[PDB]
């Protein structure tokens, strides 16, 4: 039967035009009071997942 | 479609069995034992065609040595003297000479003493 889109990945991640995989930096969900502003700010960006980890996530998204 | 074993396996077994003609008991009679026997046989043959080259040369040497000592020297001396004289007749031949041609062997012995 056809493959299913993994909804947890669909909800965390985006495949960019050239097929990199992009996600939010981890670590500002909470426990933030003593984090510097450099930290909070930088954790506010997206990052490009390491190739082996991205290639795996990509196969979970067969129809994006 | 179905492809049942058919004729194929009996034919491989006869091949092996036929190579095993001569072997003892099940070794010529049982495909399994024949095949074991053959693995061993092929490795020995390989090993032994290597050592036949050695087996003969050892023999030539025992013979040359006998023929040398009739003329008062040993194999090691005789071979060094040949070397120094520049004589390159090989041991297969030195041996045939020593038996079939004593006069020639004697002369080579002479050149060998003389060459040192």
């Amino acid at each position: 039967p056809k493959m299913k889109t993994h909804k947890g990945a669909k909800k965390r991640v985006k495949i960019t035009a050239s097929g990199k995989v992009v996600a939010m930096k981890t670590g500002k969900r909470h426990l933030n009071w003593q984090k510097s502003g450099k930290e909070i700010r930088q954790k506010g960006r997206k990052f490009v997942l390491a190739k082996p980890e991205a290639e795996r996530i990509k196969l979970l998204l067969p129809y994006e | 479609p179905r492809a049942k074993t058919g004729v194929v396996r009996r034919r491989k077994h006869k091949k092996i069995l036929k190579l095993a003609k001569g072997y003892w008991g099940l070794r010529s009679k049982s495909f399994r034992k024949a095949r074991e026997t053959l693995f061993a046989a092929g490795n020995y043959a390989y090993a032994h065609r290597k050592r036949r080259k050695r087996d003969f040369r050892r023999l030539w040497i025992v013979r040359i040595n006998a023929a040398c000592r009739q003329h008062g020297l040993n194999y090691s001396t005789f071979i060094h003297g040949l070397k120094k004289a520049g004589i390159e007749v090989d041991r297969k031949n030195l041996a045939d000479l020593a038996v079939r041609e004593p006069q020639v062997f004697a002369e080579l012995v002479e050149r060998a003493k003389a060459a040192q």
């Binding site: 993994h6 909800k11 965390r12 196969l59 | -």
Partner: protein
């Protein structure tokens, strides 16, 4: 040219890999699976795209983001597809959404928006939207922007 002459080009029809058929093939006994363990078993491993041996997975440690939607689902709103000026080059006279669908440029169910990559051509282009630069290039090349609603 006769039936006995009909052949696939070299490489067009390759043989399959057959395992577990004897030593000479170099794929016998273990059938290229190595020795023992879960992956050698019939049924094999867990989904290697996700599973990581029991530790929290790479994917599941990344944060979710944005609106995921709620029952009763997607909210119906007009959707726009852009098609650039350069794609309009091939037409002469008029372009309308219907035409662009036919040519295979605009997908059905999307409203038309004209965009600015390329040069404008003095055509009457009818559409639901124009970018700033598309409007400019078109007005400048003497073409006629018509807005649908």
């Amino acid at each position: 040219m006769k039936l006995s002459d009909l052949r696939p080009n070299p490489g067009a029809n390759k043989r399959r890999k057959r395992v577990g058929r004897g030593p000479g093939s170099g794929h016998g006994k273990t059938a290229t699976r190595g020795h023992k363990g879960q992956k050698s078993r019939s049924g094999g491993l867990k989904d290697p795209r996700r599973f990581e041996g029991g530790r929290s997975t790479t994917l599941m440690r990344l944060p979710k983001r944005g609106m995921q939607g709620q029952v009763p689902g997607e909210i119906k709103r007009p959707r726009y597809q852009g098609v650039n000026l350069k794609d309009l080059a091939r037409f002469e006279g008029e372009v309308t959404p219907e035409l662009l669908v036919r040519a295979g440029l605009l997908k059905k169910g999307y409203r038309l928006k004209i965009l600015g990559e390329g040069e404008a051509k003095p055509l009457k282009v009818v559409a639901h939207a124009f970018s700033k630069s598309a409007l400019e290039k078109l007005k400048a090349a003497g073409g006629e922007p018509v807005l649908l609603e």
